Amino acid sequence: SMQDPIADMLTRIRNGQAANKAAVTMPSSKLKVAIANVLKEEGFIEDFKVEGDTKPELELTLKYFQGKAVVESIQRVSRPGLRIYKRKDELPKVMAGLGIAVVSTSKGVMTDRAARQAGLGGEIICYVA
Amino acid sequence: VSMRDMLKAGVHFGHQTRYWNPKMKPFIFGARNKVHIINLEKTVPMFNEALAELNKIASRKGKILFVGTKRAASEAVKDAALSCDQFFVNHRWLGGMLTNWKTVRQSIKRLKDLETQSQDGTFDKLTKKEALMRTRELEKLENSLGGIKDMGGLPDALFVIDADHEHIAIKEANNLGIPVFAIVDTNSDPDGVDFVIPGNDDAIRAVTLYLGAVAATVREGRSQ
Amino acid sequence: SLSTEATAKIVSEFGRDANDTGSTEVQVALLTAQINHLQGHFAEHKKDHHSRRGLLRMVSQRRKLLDYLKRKDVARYTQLIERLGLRR
RNA sequence: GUAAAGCGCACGCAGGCGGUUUGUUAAGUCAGAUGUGAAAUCCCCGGGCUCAACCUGGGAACUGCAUCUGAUACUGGCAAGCUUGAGUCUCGUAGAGGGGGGUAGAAUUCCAGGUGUAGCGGUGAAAUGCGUAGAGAUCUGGAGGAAUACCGGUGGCGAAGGCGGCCCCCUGGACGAAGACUGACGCUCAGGUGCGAAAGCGUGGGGAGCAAACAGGAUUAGAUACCCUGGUAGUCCACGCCGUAAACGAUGUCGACUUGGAGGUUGUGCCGGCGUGGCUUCCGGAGCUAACGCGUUAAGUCGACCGCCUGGGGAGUAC
Ligand SMILES: [Mg+2]
Ligand SMILES: [Mg+2]
Ligand SMILES: [Mg+2]
Ligand SMILES: [Mg+2]
Ligand SMILES: [Mg+2]
Ligand SMILES: [Mg+2]
Ligand SMILES: [Mg+2]
Ligand SMILES: [Mg+2]
Ligand SMILES: [Mg+2]
Ligand SMILES: [Mg+2]
Ligand SMILES: [Mg+2]
Ligand SMILES: [Mg+2]
Ligand SMILES: [Mg+2]
Ligand SMILES: [Mg+2]
Ligand SMILES: [Mg+2]
Ligand SMILES: [Mg+2]
Ligand SMILES: [Mg+2]
Ligand SMILES: [Mg+2]
Ligand SMILES: [Mg+2]
Ligand SMILES: [Mg+2]
Ligand SMILES: [Mg+2]
């Protein structure tokens, strides 16, 4: 059964990018929307939108730069079988700072750099590069 | 070149849907009586862009190799090339013609080494056996390397007809970095192709239309 | 399996309506009816293993529904198991 | 997958994991602080022995623990929901799914008789064997057991093992179309439990054909074989046991996602055409792979949980 919607969303992005899809759609959730907001404001996806009243669907517009997918790698880190939390001193750098780690802090879901600037740790959702 | 003449020449008739290369999907329009219709509303800018990139290439000391051996093209692709002082290959592409130019160049060296003997008379000196042999060597090197005798070297563009049939010539172009302009049908891959003209590449009228357009464009480029 | 009439009768008795075919009490009562009925079949056909797999599936589903009901509403659970004569 | 390695298959307790929304909590988590974390040691900065080793002053560090005060995104608890996962109902559909009973036709063998007469049978060739006490062949009648030609199909059904004439009785699952209903009731599963080809074992039946063992005839240097002529367990039935197979896709289960082509089978919608579901065969793209290959039924891209491996032999043996 489906037991990690976030890994599912990351996999949908990864597979759609590999397949050169212009967009991917998945069932929505507020956590997925927060992650997509981080992805969009960091430049990894073009845009996202949610449609539907009782069964919301989240659609992500993927982006490509020069025939290449922009999301080079996208990887789940904390997962249901093994949760990963980091204090602010031990927040991971992704690709020596050229990528991002998406962190759920008590002030919301943000990049590792934003969490570092806010002086917070949290759950390491995924690495995007 | 504008839409109506493409319908007249049947540019929009592709192959049967079962022989399609899924990567042609973006130029496909429908599947009529189970055959694929090409979206000519893209054959145009695409083609018109191909015709401008050629010009830019020609108009600048340009060397355009036409490529079309499919027997419903050989004759057709010679004259279009012949009409613009360009080179052609309309009888089987010899594996290596480009990548193996240093060897192939020696056989054209043989074509002139021997053609210039069909006139100098040298044959008036054989046991009728060896001269009627050197002639088979002529009509043979004339059949394949006949249209690239004057190329005197590698080209600045290929204008291939049927990226599927001419897959060897394109991989060679790609390997050497010479741009490829080609008619890719609904059964062919446009991957190694630099200018894709989605369109029919086995109807005589469509191939004649493309060849005429390219030859006129190259003549304009050289004249300017 | 249960006939249309026996199924509809159980649905009317245990359901909160004749349309309420999905409530846990209705599902458990239908399963209990079929299990009790099949006791006679398997008393005669002891080597009918293939059918007995379906019977054991009925038993397992009923156990799961009863556990769900007990965790969800213990009073409904108690009423149900008293009406149907189930140990637990 | 083939190098060592997916339990034969399944159900399922403990356990691990858990769709979506709101509130609440603040356990996990995170932030700050306080106490503590001996000194030495390590590390950084200095200082002393001519240098160094050594000695030594301050720091850092001791990633820990406890407490207090905050944060509330995620995870957990609690409360209320929701319907998309899971399930119930209604109507139909295909099927060698299972259990029980009955029955049909073909054939083999045996028994009785008729006709008939010198061979039959068998092999590479023979011989053993059968036959004038009348075989073999052919006809009639009877007995009995086992299996169901054709249909029949990289067809179907089943969790796997498996399942094939026809008819009835009892019974399990799957699938499709419209809805209605329940409202996360789910997934996986150590231990446990159940099922589990063939052979084998126990008791009682049955025994046509076939056939381990066994006997004879050949072959051969030998021939405890392959070939031949016979032939008993067994193969069949009931009930119990055994629990293993190259039990194989040598590929654990569940869910999601990701270009195509040609078929098979089984539903269903609309007008032979166009859709839309289930199962399934072959080819192949990206990707993957040591390669072979796999390729939407993945060996691709991911998540949950379990099983299992760690050079060859000794050994799946000894105790
Ligand atoms: Mg092996
Ligand atoms: Mg192995
Ligand atoms: Mg297996
Ligand atoms: Mg299970
Ligand atoms: Mg949850
Ligand atoms: Mg706390
Ligand atoms: Mg200390
Ligand atoms: Mg000093
Ligand atoms: Mg010190
Ligand atoms: Mg909560
Ligand atoms: Mg076990
Ligand atoms: Mg047996
Ligand atoms: Mg026995
Ligand atoms: Mg016998
Ligand atoms: Mg024998
Ligand atoms: Mg075994
Ligand atoms: Mg088998
Ligand atoms: Mg098999
Ligand atoms: Mg195995
Ligand atoms: Mg394949
Ligand atoms: Mg042993």
Side-chain angles (χ1 to χ4, degrees), chain C residues 20-22 27 37 41 45 48 50 64 68:
Chain C
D20 185 43
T21 50
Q27 295 193 51
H37 171 84
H41 170 89
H45 303 300
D48 191 4
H50 291 66
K64 277 165 171 151
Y68 167 73

mmCIF file of all heavy atoms in Angstrom, chain C residues 20-22 27 37 41 45 48 50 64 68, chain D residues 12 87-88 98-99 161 170-171 181 184 240:
data_model
loop_
_atom_site.group_PDB
_atom_site.id
_atom_site.type_symbol
_atom_site.label_atom_id
_atom_site.label_comp_id
_atom_site.label_asym_id
_atom_site.label_seq_id
_atom_site.Cartn_x
_atom_site.Cartn_y
_atom_site.Cartn_z
ATOM 1 N N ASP C 20 -28.428 0.581 3.893
ATOM 2 C CA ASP C 20 -27.183 0.582 4.655
ATOM 3 C C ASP C 20 -26.560 -0.809 4.599
ATOM 4 O O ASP C 20 -26.542 -1.564 5.572
ATOM 5 C CB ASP C 20 -27.437 1.028 6.085
ATOM 6 C CG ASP C 20 -26.169 1.168 6.874
ATOM 7 O OD1 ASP C 20 -25.192 1.711 6.329
ATOM 8 O OD2 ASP C 20 -26.147 0.740 8.040
ATOM 9 N N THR C 21 -26.024 -1.143 3.433
ATOM 10 C CA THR C 21 -25.363 -2.422 3.245
ATOM 11 C C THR C 21 -23.925 -2.424 3.735
ATOM 12 O O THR C 21 -23.356 -3.498 3.935
ATOM 13 C CB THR C 21 -25.378 -2.810 1.770
ATOM 14 O OG1 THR C 21 -24.902 -1.716 0.982
ATOM 15 C CG2 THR C 21 -26.782 -3.116 1.341
ATOM 16 N N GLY C 22 -23.336 -1.255 3.942
ATOM 17 C CA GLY C 22 -21.924 -1.173 4.232
ATOM 18 C C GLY C 22 -21.531 -1.073 5.677
ATOM 19 O O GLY C 22 -20.342 -1.187 5.972
ATOM 20 N N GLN C 27 -22.000 -6.030 7.689
ATOM 21 C CA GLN C 27 -20.956 -6.876 7.124
ATOM 22 C C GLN C 27 -20.675 -8.070 8.027
ATOM 23 O O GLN C 27 -20.559 -9.206 7.558
ATOM 24 C CB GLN C 27 -19.682 -6.059 6.892
ATOM 25 C CG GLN C 27 -19.820 -4.965 5.865
ATOM 26 C CD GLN C 27 -18.486 -4.397 5.434
ATOM 27 O OE1 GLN C 27 -17.582 -5.131 5.059
ATOM 28 N NE2 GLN C 27 -18.356 -3.088 5.495
ATOM 29 N N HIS C 37 -23.689 -21.124 7.959
ATOM 30 C CA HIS C 37 -24.228 -21.981 6.913
ATOM 31 C C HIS C 37 -23.190 -22.990 6.438
ATOM 32 O O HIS C 37 -23.470 -24.189 6.349
ATOM 33 C CB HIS C 37 -24.730 -21.137 5.748
ATOM 34 C CG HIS C 37 -25.105 -21.946 4.552
ATOM 35 N ND1 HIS C 37 -26.339 -22.541 4.416
ATOM 36 C CD2 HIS C 37 -24.408 -22.264 3.438
ATOM 37 C CE1 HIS C 37 -26.385 -23.195 3.272
ATOM 38 N NE2 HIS C 37 -25.227 -23.040 2.656
ATOM 39 N N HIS C 41 -21.733 -27.609 5.185
ATOM 40 C CA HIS C 41 -21.002 -28.052 4.002
ATOM 41 C C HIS C 41 -19.704 -28.741 4.393
ATOM 42 O O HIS C 41 -19.396 -29.830 3.904
ATOM 43 C CB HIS C 41 -20.723 -26.867 3.078
ATOM 44 C CG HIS C 41 -19.785 -27.183 1.956
ATOM 45 N ND1 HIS C 41 -20.215 -27.661 0.739
ATOM 46 C CD2 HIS C 41 -18.441 -27.067 1.859
ATOM 47 C CE1 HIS C 41 -19.177 -27.840 -0.055
ATOM 48 N NE2 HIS C 41 -18.088 -27.489 0.602
ATOM 49 N N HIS C 45 -18.051 -32.256 3.587
ATOM 50 C CA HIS C 45 -16.940 -32.220 2.646
ATOM 51 C C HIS C 45 -15.683 -31.772 3.382
ATOM 52 O O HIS C 45 -15.260 -30.623 3.309
ATOM 53 C CB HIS C 45 -17.281 -31.298 1.487
ATOM 54 C CG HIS C 45 -18.535 -31.680 0.774
ATOM 55 N ND1 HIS C 45 -18.697 -32.902 0.161
ATOM 56 C CD2 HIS C 45 -19.707 -31.024 0.622
ATOM 57 C CE1 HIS C 45 -19.902 -32.967 -0.369
ATOM 58 N NE2 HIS C 45 -20.536 -31.842 -0.102
ATOM 59 N N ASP C 48 -12.656 -30.562 1.141
ATOM 60 C CA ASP C 48 -12.871 -29.401 0.287
ATOM 61 C C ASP C 48 -12.011 -28.241 0.796
ATOM 62 O O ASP C 48 -12.493 -27.250 1.339
ATOM 63 C CB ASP C 48 -14.350 -29.053 0.245
ATOM 64 C CG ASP C 48 -14.678 -28.039 -0.813
ATOM 65 O OD1 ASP C 48 -13.778 -27.655 -1.568
ATOM 66 O OD2 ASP C 48 -15.833 -27.604 -0.878
ATOM 67 N N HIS C 50 -10.147 -26.142 -0.969
ATOM 68 C CA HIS C 50 -10.197 -24.927 -1.769
ATOM 69 C C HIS C 50 -11.341 -24.025 -1.324
ATOM 70 O O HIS C 50 -11.158 -22.816 -1.164
ATOM 71 C CB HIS C 50 -10.300 -25.279 -3.254
ATOM 72 C CG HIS C 50 -9.054 -25.892 -3.819
ATOM 73 N ND1 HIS C 50 -8.589 -27.128 -3.432
ATOM 74 C CD2 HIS C 50 -8.179 -25.438 -4.745
ATOM 75 C CE1 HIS C 50 -7.486 -27.412 -4.097
ATOM 76 N NE2 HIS C 50 -7.216 -26.402 -4.900
ATOM 77 N N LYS C 64 -11.340 -8.949 11.621
ATOM 78 C CA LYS C 64 -10.829 -7.596 11.428
ATOM 79 C C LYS C 64 -11.923 -6.547 11.600
ATOM 80 O O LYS C 64 -11.708 -5.513 12.244
ATOM 81 C CB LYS C 64 -10.163 -7.480 10.057
ATOM 82 C CG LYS C 64 -8.734 -7.975 10.083
ATOM 83 C CD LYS C 64 -8.156 -8.206 8.717
ATOM 84 C CE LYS C 64 -6.665 -8.477 8.826
ATOM 85 N NZ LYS C 64 -6.162 -9.330 7.741
ATOM 86 N N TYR C 68 -12.109 -3.583 14.465
ATOM 87 C CA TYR C 68 -12.341 -2.186 14.123
ATOM 88 C C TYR C 68 -13.524 -1.624 14.896
ATOM 89 O O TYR C 68 -13.451 -0.529 15.457
ATOM 90 C CB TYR C 68 -12.581 -2.033 12.626
ATOM 91 C CG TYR C 68 -13.127 -0.678 12.256
ATOM 92 C CD1 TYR C 68 -12.314 0.434 12.281
ATOM 93 C CD2 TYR C 68 -14.453 -0.509 11.903
ATOM 94 C CE1 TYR C 68 -12.793 1.668 11.954
ATOM 95 C CE2 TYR C 68 -14.941 0.726 11.572
ATOM 96 C CZ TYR C 68 -14.104 1.813 11.603
ATOM 97 O OH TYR C 68 -14.565 3.056 11.280
ATOM 98 P P G D 12 -5.087 -12.500 6.711
ATOM 99 O OP1 G D 12 -6.360 -11.776 6.831
ATOM 100 O OP2 G D 12 -4.034 -11.948 5.849
ATOM 101 O "O5'" G D 12 -4.463 -12.680 8.162
ATOM 102 C "C5'" G D 12 -5.212 -13.220 9.236
ATOM 103 C "C4'" G D 12 -4.305 -13.661 10.353
ATOM 104 O "O4'" G D 12 -3.397 -14.683 9.875
ATOM 105 C "C3'" G D 12 -3.392 -12.589 10.915
ATOM 106 O "O3'" G D 12 -4.045 -11.783 11.873
ATOM 107 C "C2'" G D 12 -2.238 -13.396 11.486
ATOM 108 O "O2'" G D 12 -2.580 -13.942 12.744
ATOM 109 C "C1'" G D 12 -2.134 -14.532 10.473
ATOM 110 N N9 G D 12 -1.154 -14.212 9.425
ATOM 111 C C8 G D 12 -1.410 -13.656 8.204
ATOM 112 N N7 G D 12 -0.348 -13.474 7.504
ATOM 113 C C5 G D 12 0.673 -13.914 8.312
ATOM 114 C C6 G D 12 2.059 -13.963 8.078
ATOM 115 O O6 G D 12 2.667 -13.601 7.076
ATOM 116 N N1 G D 12 2.739 -14.492 9.153
ATOM 117 C C2 G D 12 2.167 -14.923 10.311
ATOM 118 N N2 G D 12 3.003 -15.398 11.239
ATOM 119 N N3 G D 12 0.877 -14.885 10.542
ATOM 120 C C4 G D 12 0.196 -14.373 9.507
ATOM 121 P P G D 87 -10.560 -5.031 -0.819
ATOM 122 O OP1 G D 87 -10.098 -6.420 -0.975
ATOM 123 O OP2 G D 87 -10.702 -4.169 -2.001
ATOM 124 O "O5'" G D 87 -11.982 -5.030 -0.106
ATOM 125 C "C5'" G D 87 -12.249 -5.882 0.989
ATOM 126 C "C4'" G D 87 -13.373 -5.376 1.862
ATOM 127 O "O4'" G D 87 -13.276 -3.945 2.071
ATOM 128 C "C3'" G D 87 -14.786 -5.554 1.350
ATOM 129 O "O3'" G D 87 -15.260 -6.880 1.442
ATOM 130 C "C2'" G D 87 -15.551 -4.577 2.223
ATOM 131 O "O2'" G D 87 -15.698 -5.100 3.531
ATOM 132 C "C1'" G D 87 -14.567 -3.414 2.287
ATOM 133 N N9 G D 87 -14.861 -2.409 1.251
ATOM 134 C C8 G D 87 -14.088 -2.041 0.187
ATOM 135 N N7 G D 87 -14.640 -1.134 -0.554
ATOM 136 C C5 G D 87 -15.853 -0.882 0.049
ATOM 137 C C6 G D 87 -16.889 0.011 -0.299
ATOM 138 O O6 G D 87 -16.955 0.791 -1.242
ATOM 139 N N1 G D 87 -17.945 -0.058 0.588
ATOM 140 C C2 G D 87 -17.995 -0.876 1.672
ATOM 141 N N2 G D 87 -19.086 -0.819 2.428
ATOM 142 N N3 G D 87 -17.042 -1.708 2.007
ATOM 143 C C4 G D 87 -16.004 -1.663 1.161
ATOM 144 P P U D 88 -16.322 -7.427 0.377
ATOM 145 O OP1 U D 88 -16.395 -8.890 0.515
ATOM 146 O OP2 U D 88 -16.043 -6.822 -0.934
ATOM 147 O "O5'" U D 88 -17.707 -6.832 0.869
ATOM 148 C "C5'" U D 88 -18.246 -7.194 2.127
ATOM 149 C "C4'" U D 88 -19.585 -6.547 2.361
ATOM 150 O "O4'" U D 88 -19.428 -5.110 2.418
ATOM 151 C "C3'" U D 88 -20.630 -6.756 1.279
ATOM 152 O "O3'" U D 88 -21.288 -8.005 1.366
ATOM 153 C "C2'" U D 88 -21.550 -5.565 1.485
ATOM 154 O "O2'" U D 88 -22.386 -5.772 2.607
ATOM 155 C "C1'" U D 88 -20.552 -4.480 1.849
ATOM 156 N N1 U D 88 -20.108 -3.701 0.675
ATOM 157 C C2 U D 88 -20.955 -2.754 0.141
ATOM 158 O O2 U D 88 -22.055 -2.535 0.580
ATOM 159 N N3 U D 88 -20.462 -2.067 -0.929
ATOM 160 C C4 U D 88 -19.231 -2.228 -1.505
ATOM 161 O O4 U D 88 -18.908 -1.546 -2.468
ATOM 162 C C5 U D 88 -18.413 -3.218 -0.897
ATOM 163 C C6 U D 88 -18.866 -3.899 0.143
ATOM 164 P P G D 98 -10.623 -28.457 -9.643
ATOM 165 O OP1 G D 98 -9.647 -29.486 -10.003
ATOM 166 O OP2 G D 98 -11.906 -28.414 -10.350
ATOM 167 O "O5'" G D 98 -10.970 -28.617 -8.103
ATOM 168 C "C5'" G D 98 -10.065 -28.232 -7.085
ATOM 169 C "C4'" G D 98 -10.764 -28.180 -5.757
ATOM 170 O "O4'" G D 98 -11.706 -27.080 -5.741
ATOM 171 C "C3'" G D 98 -11.608 -29.395 -5.416
ATOM 172 O "O3'" G D 98 -10.847 -30.454 -4.879
ATOM 173 C "C2'" G D 98 -12.626 -28.828 -4.443
ATOM 174 O "O2'" G D 98 -12.056 -28.650 -3.158
ATOM 175 C "C1'" G D 98 -12.872 -27.453 -5.045
ATOM 176 N N9 G D 98 -14.003 -27.464 -5.985
ATOM 177 C C8 G D 98 -13.970 -27.319 -7.341
ATOM 178 N N7 G D 98 -15.145 -27.378 -7.882
ATOM 179 C C5 G D 98 -16.011 -27.576 -6.826
ATOM 180 C C6 G D 98 -17.418 -27.724 -6.783
ATOM 181 O O6 G D 98 -18.220 -27.704 -7.708
ATOM 182 N N1 G D 98 -17.868 -27.911 -5.493
ATOM 183 C C2 G D 98 -17.081 -27.948 -4.378
ATOM 184 N N2 G D 98 -17.686 -28.135 -3.213
ATOM 185 N N3 G D 98 -15.780 -27.816 -4.406
ATOM 186 C C4 G D 98 -15.315 -27.636 -5.648
ATOM 187 P P G D 99 -11.214 -31.973 -5.210
ATOM 188 O OP1 G D 99 -10.108 -32.805 -4.726
ATOM 189 O OP2 G D 99 -11.612 -32.060 -6.625
ATOM 190 O "O5'" G D 99 -12.461 -32.276 -4.280
ATOM 191 C "C5'" G D 99 -12.365 -32.173 -2.872
ATOM 192 C "C4'" G D 99 -13.710 -32.345 -2.220
ATOM 193 O "O4'" G D 99 -14.550 -31.194 -2.496
ATOM 194 C "C3'" G D 99 -14.543 -33.511 -2.713
ATOM 195 O "O3'" G D 99 -14.140 -34.753 -2.181
ATOM 196 C "C2'" G D 99 -15.943 -33.096 -2.308
ATOM 197 O "O2'" G D 99 -16.126 -33.261 -0.915
ATOM 198 C "C1'" G D 99 -15.895 -31.606 -2.616
ATOM 199 N N9 G D 99 -16.350 -31.356 -3.986
ATOM 200 C C8 G D 99 -15.599 -31.061 -5.083
ATOM 201 N N7 G D 99 -16.312 -30.927 -6.152
ATOM 202 C C5 G D 99 -17.605 -31.163 -5.735
ATOM 203 C C6 G D 99 -18.815 -31.165 -6.450
ATOM 204 O O6 G D 99 -18.986 -30.943 -7.639
ATOM 205 N N1 G D 99 -19.888 -31.461 -5.633
ATOM 206 C C2 G D 99 -19.818 -31.720 -4.297
ATOM 207 N N2 G D 99 -20.958 -31.988 -3.670
ATOM 208 N N3 G D 99 -18.695 -31.722 -3.620
ATOM 209 C C4 G D 99 -17.644 -31.438 -4.399
ATOM 210 P P G D 161 2.071 -24.148 -9.032
ATOM 211 O OP1 G D 161 3.235 -24.280 -9.922
ATOM 212 O OP2 G D 161 0.774 -23.869 -9.641
ATOM 213 O "O5'" G D 161 1.950 -25.472 -8.171
ATOM 214 C "C5'" G D 161 3.074 -26.007 -7.500
ATOM 215 C "C4'" G D 161 2.687 -27.153 -6.613
ATOM 216 O "O4'" G D 161 1.724 -26.724 -5.619
ATOM 217 C "C3'" G D 161 1.992 -28.310 -7.295
ATOM 218 O "O3'" G D 161 2.875 -29.146 -8.005
ATOM 219 C "C2'" G D 161 1.294 -28.995 -6.133
ATOM 220 O "O2'" G D 161 2.213 -29.752 -5.371
ATOM 221 C "C1'" G D 161 0.857 -27.792 -5.306
ATOM 222 N N9 G D 161 -0.514 -27.392 -5.651
ATOM 223 C C8 G D 161 -0.892 -26.240 -6.265
ATOM 224 N N7 G D 161 -2.172 -26.175 -6.455
ATOM 225 C C5 G D 161 -2.667 -27.359 -5.946
ATOM 226 C C6 G D 161 -3.987 -27.868 -5.871
ATOM 227 O O6 G D 161 -5.042 -27.371 -6.244
ATOM 228 N N1 G D 161 -4.017 -29.112 -5.280
ATOM 229 C C2 G D 161 -2.937 -29.794 -4.815
ATOM 230 N N2 G D 161 -3.175 -30.988 -4.281
ATOM 231 N N3 G D 161 -1.707 -29.338 -4.875
ATOM 232 C C4 G D 161 -1.645 -28.127 -5.453
ATOM 233 P P C D 170 -27.773 -27.572 -4.366
ATOM 234 O OP1 C D 170 -28.876 -26.942 -3.613
ATOM 235 O OP2 C D 170 -27.414 -27.026 -5.683
ATOM 236 O "O5'" C D 170 -26.477 -27.541 -3.447
ATOM 237 C "C5'" C D 170 -26.471 -28.153 -2.169
ATOM 238 C "C4'" C D 170 -25.083 -28.216 -1.585
ATOM 239 O "O4'" C D 170 -24.282 -29.194 -2.300
ATOM 240 C "C3'" C D 170 -24.246 -26.953 -1.671
ATOM 241 O "O3'" C D 170 -24.599 -25.966 -0.726
ATOM 242 C "C2'" C D 170 -22.841 -27.498 -1.495
ATOM 243 O "O2'" C D 170 -22.597 -27.841 -0.142
ATOM 244 C "C1'" C D 170 -22.929 -28.782 -2.308
ATOM 245 N N1 C D 170 -22.499 -28.554 -3.702
ATOM 246 C C2 C D 170 -21.129 -28.470 -3.942
ATOM 247 O O2 C D 170 -20.361 -28.604 -2.990
ATOM 248 N N3 C D 170 -20.692 -28.256 -5.187
ATOM 249 C C4 C D 170 -21.565 -28.120 -6.170
ATOM 250 N N4 C D 170 -21.094 -27.915 -7.386
ATOM 251 C C5 C D 170 -22.967 -28.189 -5.959
ATOM 252 C C6 C D 170 -23.393 -28.404 -4.718
ATOM 253 P P U D 171 -24.456 -24.412 -1.096
ATOM 254 O OP1 U D 171 -24.866 -23.632 0.083
ATOM 255 O OP2 U D 171 -25.119 -24.163 -2.381
ATOM 256 O "O5'" U D 171 -22.897 -24.190 -1.316
ATOM 257 C "C5'" U D 171 -21.978 -24.364 -0.255
ATOM 258 C "C4'" U D 171 -20.550 -24.308 -0.731
ATOM 259 O "O4'" U D 171 -20.294 -25.329 -1.730
ATOM 260 C "C3'" U D 171 -20.113 -23.036 -1.420
ATOM 261 O "O3'" U D 171 -19.912 -21.959 -0.530
ATOM 262 C "C2'" U D 171 -18.854 -23.493 -2.143
ATOM 263 O "O2'" U D 171 -17.776 -23.636 -1.237
ATOM 264 C "C1'" U D 171 -19.273 -24.888 -2.603
ATOM 265 N N1 U D 171 -19.784 -24.850 -3.988
ATOM 266 C C2 U D 171 -18.838 -24.767 -4.981
ATOM 267 O O2 U D 171 -17.653 -24.754 -4.758
ATOM 268 N N3 U D 171 -19.327 -24.710 -6.252
ATOM 269 C C4 U D 171 -20.641 -24.718 -6.621
ATOM 270 O O4 U D 171 -20.915 -24.661 -7.808
ATOM 271 C C5 U D 171 -21.568 -24.798 -5.543
ATOM 272 C C6 U D 171 -21.121 -24.852 -4.287
ATOM 273 P P C D 181 -25.471 6.679 -0.162
ATOM 274 O OP1 C D 181 -26.158 7.632 0.728
ATOM 275 O OP2 C D 181 -24.342 7.132 -0.995
ATOM 276 O "O5'" C D 181 -24.963 5.488 0.753
ATOM 277 C "C5'" C D 181 -25.871 4.780 1.571
ATOM 278 C "C4'" C D 181 -25.242 3.543 2.150
ATOM 279 O "O4'" C D 181 -24.714 2.707 1.096
ATOM 280 C "C3'" C D 181 -24.052 3.766 3.058
ATOM 281 O "O3'" C D 181 -24.418 4.181 4.356
ATOM 282 C "C2'" C D 181 -23.361 2.415 3.026
ATOM 283 O "O2'" C D 181 -24.033 1.493 3.867
ATOM 284 C "C1'" C D 181 -23.598 1.990 1.577
ATOM 285 N N1 C D 181 -22.432 2.232 0.693
ATOM 286 C C2 C D 181 -21.273 1.482 0.888
ATOM 287 O O2 C D 181 -21.266 0.668 1.808
ATOM 288 N N3 C D 181 -20.211 1.657 0.088
ATOM 289 C C4 C D 181 -20.263 2.546 -0.888
ATOM 290 N N4 C D 181 -19.183 2.686 -1.647
ATOM 291 C C5 C D 181 -21.429 3.323 -1.123
ATOM 292 C C6 C D 181 -22.482 3.128 -0.325
ATOM 293 P P A D 184 -12.586 5.696 9.725
ATOM 294 O OP1 A D 184 -12.943 5.077 11.009
ATOM 295 O OP2 A D 184 -12.344 7.143 9.641
ATOM 296 O "O5'" A D 184 -11.276 4.988 9.190
ATOM 297 C "C5'" A D 184 -11.196 3.574 9.077
ATOM 298 C "C4'" A D 184 -9.826 3.141 8.628
ATOM 299 O "O4'" A D 184 -9.709 3.311 7.191
ATOM 300 C "C3'" A D 184 -8.671 3.920 9.245
ATOM 301 O "O3'" A D 184 -7.570 3.043 9.449
ATOM 302 C "C2'" A D 184 -8.330 4.926 8.151
ATOM 303 O "O2'" A D 184 -7.014 5.424 8.194
ATOM 304 C "C1'" A D 184 -8.583 4.103 6.899
ATOM 305 N N9 A D 184 -8.877 4.892 5.704
ATOM 306 C C8 A D 184 -9.997 5.623 5.449
ATOM 307 N N7 A D 184 -9.976 6.224 4.293
ATOM 308 C C5 A D 184 -8.768 5.852 3.743
ATOM 309 C C6 A D 184 -8.156 6.149 2.519
ATOM 310 N N6 A D 184 -8.701 6.926 1.588
ATOM 311 N N1 A D 184 -6.946 5.615 2.280
ATOM 312 C C2 A D 184 -6.397 4.838 3.207
ATOM 313 N N3 A D 184 -6.877 4.486 4.389
ATOM 314 C C4 A D 184 -8.083 5.027 4.598
ATOM 315 P P G D 240 -8.372 -38.208 6.851
ATOM 316 O OP1 G D 240 -8.855 -37.052 7.625
ATOM 317 O OP2 G D 240 -8.003 -38.009 5.438
ATOM 318 O "O5'" G D 240 -7.067 -38.803 7.530
ATOM 319 C "C5'" G D 240 -6.961 -38.935 8.932
ATOM 320 C "C4'" G D 240 -5.756 -39.754 9.321
ATOM 321 O "O4'" G D 240 -5.730 -41.003 8.583
ATOM 322 C "C3'" G D 240 -4.394 -39.155 9.031
ATOM 323 O "O3'" G D 240 -4.016 -38.119 9.921
ATOM 324 C "C2'" G D 240 -3.506 -40.382 9.101
ATOM 325 O "O2'" G D 240 -3.337 -40.794 10.445
ATOM 326 C "C1'" G D 240 -4.390 -41.411 8.401
ATOM 327 N N9 G D 240 -4.075 -41.479 6.964
ATOM 328 C C8 G D 240 -4.750 -40.987 5.882
ATOM 329 N N7 G D 240 -4.137 -41.215 4.759
ATOM 330 C C5 G D 240 -2.981 -41.882 5.122
ATOM 331 C C6 G D 240 -1.900 -42.401 4.367
ATOM 332 O O6 G D 240 -1.725 -42.372 3.162
ATOM 333 N N1 G D 240 -0.935 -42.995 5.158
ATOM 334 C C2 G D 240 -0.997 -43.098 6.511
ATOM 335 N N2 G D 240 0.010 -43.704 7.134
ATOM 336 N N3 G D 240 -1.986 -42.625 7.224
ATOM 337 C C4 G D 240 -2.934 -42.045 6.477
#
